[PDB]
């Protein structure tokens, strides 16, 4: 308990103040948040993992090429850092947590990362590796939030697979082999081929019960949006942010959600 006052107290106070102050306009807000995060530079590993979260997607996008030069336009330092096509993939395998594992898991390069569906599969595998790495750094209450996020991503991928991607070889086995209680009981979603079946599978977790509801919204989207939208709706739990705990990831997630809401506002 005394370690917080021993070190990291000032950074924690600054992060708490910045989060409390938070609430091309979307691009400007994202740039301001990224600058605030960068200026803040134990917690170093947490910041590295938080950045690597979006850096996995940034590297996946940069893996194209095929109009690859356009990736510089979205070079947001929050996720699109320069430090984080097999020949170039081997070079990019450094300075990232999920990259060494993806080097072997996605050794087929574009063959296993086709832009239609297999690129999404490689992105999901990288996200699973990053989630495993983040969960490895256990010791705080953020483990529950990380597990919830990974479960939401896995369940959304499984729902998308059962909806229409089953014809894209995303079968029941692929619901966990390629599509990133879920780390132990994800087998219940392998047969949830229907919206009613999805609700029944969600009934296995009473907290996840009634989250799907009519499933008209949230679950209607493919990729990782089905159960991820449930996490977005329940993010009010993340809004608690009890003191003397790692809240940098929570602040980053809140800033990202605010940026997304501002983008969704657009022209009213």
């Amino acid at each position: 308990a005394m370690t917080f006052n021993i070190h990291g107290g000032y950074l924690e106070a600054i992060v708490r103040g910045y989060r409390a102050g938070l609430l091309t306009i979307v691009e400007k807000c994202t740039l301001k948040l990224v600058d605030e995060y960068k200026h803040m530079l134990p917690l170093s590993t947490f910041l590295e993992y938080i950045t690597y979260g979006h850096m996995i997607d940034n590297v996946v996008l940069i893996v194209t090429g095929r109009d690859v030069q356009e990736l510089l336009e979205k070079c947001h330092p929050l996720g699109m850092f320069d430090s984080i096509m097999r020949e170039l993939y081997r070079l990019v395998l450094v300075d990232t947590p999920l990259a060494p594992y993806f080097s072997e898991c996605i050794t087929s390069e574009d063959l296993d990362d086709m832009n239609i569906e297999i690129m999404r599969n490689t992105l999901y595998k990288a996200y699973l590796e990053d989630f495993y790495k983040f969960c490895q750094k256990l010791g705080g209450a953020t483990a529950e939030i990380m597990s919830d996020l990974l479960a939401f991503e896995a369940d959304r991928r499984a729902v998308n697979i059962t909806i229409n991607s089953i014809g894209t070889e995303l079968t029941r086995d692929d619901r966990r082999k390629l599509y990133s209680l879920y780390p132990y009981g994800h087998e219940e979603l392998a047969v949830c081929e229907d919206i009613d079946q999805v609700r029944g599978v969600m009934e296995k977790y009473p907290p996840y019960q009634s989250i799907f509801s009519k499933l008209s919204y949230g679950e209607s989207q493919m990729l990782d949006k089905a159960f991820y939208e449930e996490e977005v709706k329940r993010l009010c739990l993340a809004f608690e942010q009890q003191f003397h705990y790692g809240v940098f990831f929570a602040y980053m997630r809140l800033r990202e959600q605010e940026i997304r809401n501002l983008m969704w506002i657009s022209e009213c």
């Binding site: 308990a1 608690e240 009890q242 003191f243 003397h244």
Partner: protein, 152 residues
């Protein structure tokens, strides 16, 4: 000669009691500040659990006072039995207070969060905390009984 142990009992009784009292008050206080960030009115009433934790220090302080008063060397011959009894009496009171405060701190910290979420459960949290705080009173009773055995 033996009275060194008896004197040490009174110091240990206060030290170990305050050690748990500070730990309980710290955990209870931290949760109160967290609730006070958003819920303005709930935090003011929630300070009772912190006040309850601070009472345990008073109970230990009184127990220490009795032990000190009973160690008068020039009044009566403080044999080894009196020194052993006083040290034993202090040890129970100090240890019990440390445990009792620790539970109150753990319970109180969760209680502040629970009250900030659903105000209805505030009565339930108080009841559990009050029941837990009875252990310190139980330790106080044992301390008085043990200290009373200084007759011979």
């Amino acid at each position: 000669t033996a009275p060194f142990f008896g004197f040490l009992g009174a110091a240990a009784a206060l030290v170990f009691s305050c050690m748990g009292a500070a730990y309980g008050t710290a955990k209870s206080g931290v949760g109160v500040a967290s609730m006070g960030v958003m819920r303005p009115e709930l935090v003011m009433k929630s300070i009772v659990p912190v006040v309850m934790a601070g009472v345990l220090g008073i109970y230990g302080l009184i127990i220490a006072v009795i032990i000190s008063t009973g160690i008068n060397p020039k009044a009566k011959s403080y044999y080894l039995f009196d020194g052993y009894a006083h040290l034993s009496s202090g040890l129970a009171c100090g240890l019990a207070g440390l445990s009792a405060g620790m539970a109150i701190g753990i319970v109180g910290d969760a209680g502040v969060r629970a009250n900030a979420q659903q105000p209805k459960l505030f009565v339930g949290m108080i009841l559990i905390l009050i029941f837990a705080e009875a252990l310190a009173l139980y330790g106080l009773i044992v301390g008085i009984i043990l200290s009373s055995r200084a007759g011979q």
